[PDB]
RNA sequence: CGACUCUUAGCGGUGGAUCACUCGGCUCGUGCGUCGAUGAAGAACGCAGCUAGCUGCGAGAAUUAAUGUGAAUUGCAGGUUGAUCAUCGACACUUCGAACGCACUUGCGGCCCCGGGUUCCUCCCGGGGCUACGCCUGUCUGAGCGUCGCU
RNA sequence: GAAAAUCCGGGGGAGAGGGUGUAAAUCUCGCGCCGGGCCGUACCCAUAUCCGCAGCAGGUCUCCAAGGUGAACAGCCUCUGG
RNA sequence: CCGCCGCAGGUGCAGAUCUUGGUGGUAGUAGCAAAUAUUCAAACGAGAACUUUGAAGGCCGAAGUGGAGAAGGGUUCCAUGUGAACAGCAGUUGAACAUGGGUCAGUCGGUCCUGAGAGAUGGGCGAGCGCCGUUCCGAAGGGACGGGCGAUGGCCUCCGUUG
RNA sequence: AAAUACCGGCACGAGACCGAUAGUCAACAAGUACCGUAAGGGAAAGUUGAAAAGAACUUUGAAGAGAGAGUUCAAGAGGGCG
RNA sequence: CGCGACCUCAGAUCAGACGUGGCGACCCGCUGAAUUUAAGCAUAUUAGUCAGCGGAGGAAAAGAAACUAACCAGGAUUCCCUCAGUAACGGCGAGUGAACAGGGAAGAGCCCAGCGCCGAAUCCCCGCCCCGCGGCGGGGCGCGGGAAAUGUGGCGUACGGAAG
């Protein structure tokens, strides 16, 4: 069949494609230091506003204070049963539950791509020390445990969006105040750091 | 030719026992995809190489 | 008459099956394989040619013995012991 | 070879032949026409091998 | 007869090779079975003949060779069958004795400079 | 009225688009990093109860032993003291191939040793083992108006 | 206006044979005994089994060759066979 | 499977005598016209211009449309069944298809020999795979008649196989 | 030695990749069929249904093909069939 | 003339080993183009690149200065960042083009010959016994053999070394 058919050409049958794709293309985009810190300085601010984390989307409704921080007794857990029953009594649930109805199918390719199930980001769980909350909390559908020394902008602000729903531990949240600073004092935990 | 060699003779031999159909009872399986046998060879139409 | 006519003459076999390649390219007269190379002790593969060579390469045959060198190697080409039995 | 059949028929079924005649098939599988010696009925002894 | 390995390795040398010449006479029957037109039931046991002739030729020329290379433990030149097969590159290596062969001069640095356990303070 | 012709729609064909699937690719990453005279890679030809191919295997031939596993295999028959699967360490592995007795015809031997033809008895028959090149260490045998030596 | 395998005759006469016998060594004479493996062997061989993509007016190496007319293996007509 | 907010691109076709596949009009058209020829009954069969048999008429006309082979083909051979496809009409026919069958050697060939030639070794050359060269810059013979010294088989007789 | 290279090999893990004219030439009996003297050139080809439940039976026909009947949620899925 | 030594080249189906071929992404050694670029073209460029040939390995090659330097000096090799599209090369046209220093990954050093000293103190192999290993090694025991004074082994190598 292929004798006298035609080979090389972009509109070929067969053939090749126009310009082939490299795996020298630049993927990576470098971002600067500064202008990361004064994205996770914006994201962590964003999450303390009530009304940006309804915006986001999170059910906080009836959550008691918008920077809902915990105790240091959540990082003692290591069951889900505990993680569950905070939750309830935070009147976090609800997001939780919102989560478990964002659980569907999703549309495309991505199905036979490894990406078959899609559902919505619930609340963070920022913590200082792991003792077992990331244990105690990984199982629940939506929660994405962090380190306060490490806070992700793809975790705090995801699709870039401003306002996920942060969940602090008592240690977690007065550390903040050394790893980004304030406007009289310089981070402690960063070399050279003033609060844009 | 009616002159044969033992080498040539046997390669003939053996193209003459490829060149019969499938057994019927091989299309009754569970992961059959055989409908007839593609690589029957006619003695008018292809000719054998050599 | 140089085609169709020309055509008819033709009945006497340059090449035949050459007895390490199997091909039917053993030249009588200079009684070398135009595919390997017979009476020549190396293989013949050229560079210029990437398709020839994975037609005819470790890929190709069964590997009789190298298919059992792969299976034998993952235990550490142990020898005279057998298990402990029933 | 011809003589490794008549040493092999003359052991396996008790008899002895005359000559053997061989001949390879176009099937690649070889044909050997055994001609047993006048002293033995080869109906007979078709009927002790086991064919009807 | 089911024939297992089992059974056969305790038997004798001139007791399985009767039992061969047995099972190639059985064989004999069924080939001859299958040409005469008939009999299914004889059909599926030429197979049962076929693996029970590769049983027995086993123990066999397992009982050969365990015998071999028992013959040839003590000896220094055995047969290129019985001599350990692993890579050609594996058997063209230095022995696990020479090795361990350091000369006079290296074994004298091994001696009088020996590598210490040592920790330094802050 | 026509037939015919055109346009539109319904249905029916021709055809295999679209969409939805995907035991396949492609790309990046990781650990390893192993062929062969103990016959490799590759090739040839065989091998199944019923089998062409594919796969699997080698005259023990869609496999043997051992091990683990624990009741199938299955198109159809047929026949737990381990069915079958994986594992694979024991054994086996036809012809060509670096390819090796000499040739590439499957054509010719040479030598030693076994068994028939016997009544080691030389032909004959079958079987078995050797019988390639280059080279290292030693060994044996002789070479030379080589350099000497003693008689 | 082929070579070689293979085969034979001769020329020499080194040797060999037995001492009148149951003679010997020896015989290219007549008979007797045994053995001859391996591979190929079907069929077509051309206006349909080959090669020209095909049952293609092409191409493709030979052997046998009746009766009449006639110089004739020309053409024309016939027998066998097709 | 999709809306909105960002993100990313192999992101929009009428064309390139574009690429691949599909289908039209032409068109039931061109065509099925090289080498003289068919005809009658009958048979089988659903079915006959084509098969088979018989009778007739013709052709090839021994440099054949005849009987055998070599190259090449490789089962086309033969029988029986089949009538889907294929055999450019048809088919009860076939080199199609499907089931089985078929090639028997001391004497016929191959094997053996050498021809023109091809081609190892030694040697020479060459970065090298290799190439040249074939009697050439070679210690190129592993054979036989005779004789002691010995081993052996048969009444070791004296001989066979030997050292 | 180590840091180092690795589009071949043996195992693996993954993807803002391709979705059967794409992605490897090859998702299938693919370096297969086929072509060439040879070197080499080199394809096309995925989808019945949940389960074959793959259409018994009766009927016209020489059969291929239908007509009723039947299976299934469905033949408007009838063995190149979403 | 013979006989024994040695040297030198021979023959062996001599006892025992070894090489060949493949794979070829990566690595080493060679050999080595022209498309193309210069809007022509020949030097250049493409390019020591493709093809060709050989040799490997789990990595290879490189590697412990006949070095960098010109400092108040560093200290094998390899790799990364930078130096640097720089010094320099070039129909000084098109184009080509390192190095050191510095910051890291890793980090490791060494052995001979020679010169000399000790009675060759050294080595390979065959026989028997004895442990013993599917990496053929260990201990004996032998007017057993051989290699070797045309040089084996120990000390020792430029950082010095040896002897008293």
Same mark, same amino acid.
């Not at chain 3, 070398?32 to 990437?50: F, I, L, V």
């Not at chain 4, 003589?3 to 000559?19: G, R, T």
């Given at each position: 069949?292929?004798?006298?058919?035609?080979?090389?050409?972009?509109?070929?049958?067969?053939?090749?494609?126009?310009?082939?794709?490299?795996?020298?293309?630049?993927?990576?985009?470098?971002?600067?230091?500064?202008?990361?810190?004064?994205?996770?300085?914006?994201?962590?601010?964003?999450?303390?506003?009530?009304?940006?984390?309804?915006?986001?989307?999170?059910?906080?409704?009836?959550?008691?204070?918008?920077?809902?921080?915990?105790?240091?007794?959540?990082?003692?857990?290591?069951?889900?049963?505990?993680?569950?029953?905070?939750?309830?009594?935070?009147?976090?649930?609800?997001?939780?539950?919102?989560?478990?109805?964002?659980?569907?199918?999703?549309?495309?390719?991505?199905?036979?791509?490894?990406?078959?199930?899609?559902?919505?980001?619930?609340?963070?769980?920022?913590?200082?020390?792991?003792?077992?909350?990331?244990?105690?909390?990984?199982?629940?559908?939506?929660?994405?445990?962090?380190?306060?020394?490490?806070?992700?902008?793809?975790?705090?602000?995801?699709?870039?969006?401003?306002?996920?729903?942060?969940?602090?531990?008592?240690?977690?949240?007065?550390?903040?105040?050394?790893?980004?600073?304030?406007?009289?004092?310089?981070?402690?935990?960063?070399?050279?750091?003033?609060?844009? | 030719?009616?002159?044969?060699?033992?080498?040539?003779?046997?390669?003939?031999?053996?193209?003459?026992?490829?060149?019969?159909?499938?057994?019927?009872?091989?299309?009754?399986?569970?992961?059959?995809?055989?409908?007839?046998?593609?690589?029957?060879?006619?003695?008018?139409?292809?000719?054998?190489?050599? | 008459?140089?085609?169709?006519?020309?055509?008819?003459?033709?009945?006497?076999?340059?090449?035949?099956?050459?007895?390490?390649?199997?091909?039917?390219?053993?030249?009588?007269?200079?009684?070398?394989?135009?595919?390997? @190379?017979?009476?020549?002790?190396? #293989?013949?593969? &050229?560079?210029?040619?990437?398709?020839?060579? /994975?037609?005819? +390469? *470790?890929?190709? @045959?069964?590997?009789?013995?190298? #298919?059992?060198? &792969?299976?034998?190697?993952?235990?550490?080409? /142990?020898?005279? +012991? *057998?298990?402990?039995?029933? | 070879?011809?003589?490794?059949?008549?040493?092999?028929?003359?052991?396996?079924?008790?008899?002895?032949?005359?000559?053997?005649?061989?001949?390879?098939?176009?099937?690649?599988?070889?044909?050997?026409?055994?001609?047993?010696?006048?002293?033995?009925?080869?109906?007979?002894?078709?009927?002790?091998?086991?064919?009807? | 007869?089911?024939?297992?390995?089992?059974?056969?390795?305790?038997?004798?040398?001139?007791?399985?090779?009767?039992?061969?010449?047995?099972?190639?006479?059985?064989?004999?029957?069924?080939?001859?079975?299958?040409?005469?037109?008939?009999?299914?039931?004889?059909?599926?046991?030429?197979?049962?003949?076929?693996?029970?002739?590769?049983?027995?030729?086993?123990?066999?020329?397992?009982?050969?060779?365990?015998?071999?290379?028992?013959?040839?433990?003590?000896?220094?030149?055995?047969?290129?069958?019985?001599?350990?097969?692993?890579?050609?590159?594996?058997?063209?290596?230095?022995?696990?004795?020479?090795?361990?062969?350091?000369?006079?001069?290296?074994?004298?640095?091994?001696?009088?400079?020996?590598?210490?356990?040592?920790?330094?303070?802050?």
């Amino acid at each position: 069949h292929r004798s006298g058919q035609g080979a090389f050409g972009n509109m070929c049958r067969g053939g090749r494609m126009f310009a082939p794709t490299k795996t020298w293309r630049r993927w990576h985009r470098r971002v600067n230091t500064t202008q990361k810190r004064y994205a996770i300085c914006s994201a962590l601010a964003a999450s303390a506003l009530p009304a940006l984390v309804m915006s986001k989307g999170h059910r906080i409704e009836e959550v008691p204070e918008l920077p809902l921080v915990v105790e240091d007794k959540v990082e003692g857990y290591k069951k889900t049963k505990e993680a569950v029953l905070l939750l309830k009594k935070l009147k976090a649930w609800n997001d939780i539950k919102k989560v478990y109805a964002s659980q569907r199918m999703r549309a495309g390719k991505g199905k036979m791509r490894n990406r078959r199930r899609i559902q919505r980001r619930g609340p963070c769980v920022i913590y200082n020390e792991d003792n077992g909350i990331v244990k105690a909390f990984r199982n629940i559908p939506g929660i994405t445990l962090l380190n306060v020394t490490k806070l992700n902008i793809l975790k705090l602000a995801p699709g870039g969006h401003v306002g996920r729903f942060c969940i602090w531990t008592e240690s977690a949240f007065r550390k903040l105040d050394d790893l980004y600073g304030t406007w009289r004092k310089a981070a402690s935990l960063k070399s050279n750091y003033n609060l844009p | 030719s009616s002159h044969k060699t033992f080498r040539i003779k046997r390669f003939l031999a053996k193209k003459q026992k490829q060149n019969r159909p499938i057994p019927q009872w091989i299309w009754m399986k569970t992961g059959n995809k055989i409908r007839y046998n593609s690589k029957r060879r006619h003695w008018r139409r292809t000719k054998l190489g050599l | 008459t140089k085609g169709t006519s020309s055509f008819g003459k033709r009945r006497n076999k340059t090449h035949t099956l050459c007895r390490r390649c199997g091909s039917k390219a053993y030249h009588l007269q200079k009684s070398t394989c135009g595919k390997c @190379g017979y009476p020549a002790k190396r #293989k013949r593969k &050229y560079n210029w040619s990437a398709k020839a060579k /994975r037609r005819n +390469t *470790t890929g190709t @045959g069964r590997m009789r013995h190298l #298919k059992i060198v &792969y299976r034998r190697f993952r235990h550490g080409f /142990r020898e005279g +012991t *057998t298990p402990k039995p029933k | 070879n011809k003589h490794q059949i008549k040493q092999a028929v003359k052991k396996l079924y008790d008899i002895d032949v005359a000559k053997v005649n061989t001949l390879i098939r176009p099937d690649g599988e070889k044909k050997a026409y055994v001609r047993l010696a006048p002293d033995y009925d080869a109906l007979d002894v078709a009927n002790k091998i086991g064919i009807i | 007869a089911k024939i297992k390995a089992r059974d056969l390795r305790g038997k004798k040398k001139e007791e399985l090779l009767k039992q061969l010449d047995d099972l190639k006479v059985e064989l004999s029957q069924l080939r001859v079975a299958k040409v005469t037109g008939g009999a299914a039931s004889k059909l599926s046991k030429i197979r049962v003949v076929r693996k029970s002739i590769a049983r027995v030729l086993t123990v066999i020329n397992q009982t050969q060779k365990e015998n071999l290379r028992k013959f040839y433990k003590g000896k220094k030149y055995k047969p290129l069958d019985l001599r350990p097969k692993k890579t050609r590159a594996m058997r063209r290596r230095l022995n696990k004795h020479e090795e361990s062969l350091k000369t006079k001069k290296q074994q004298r640095k091994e001696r009088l400079y020996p590598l210490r356990k040592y920790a330094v303070k802050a």
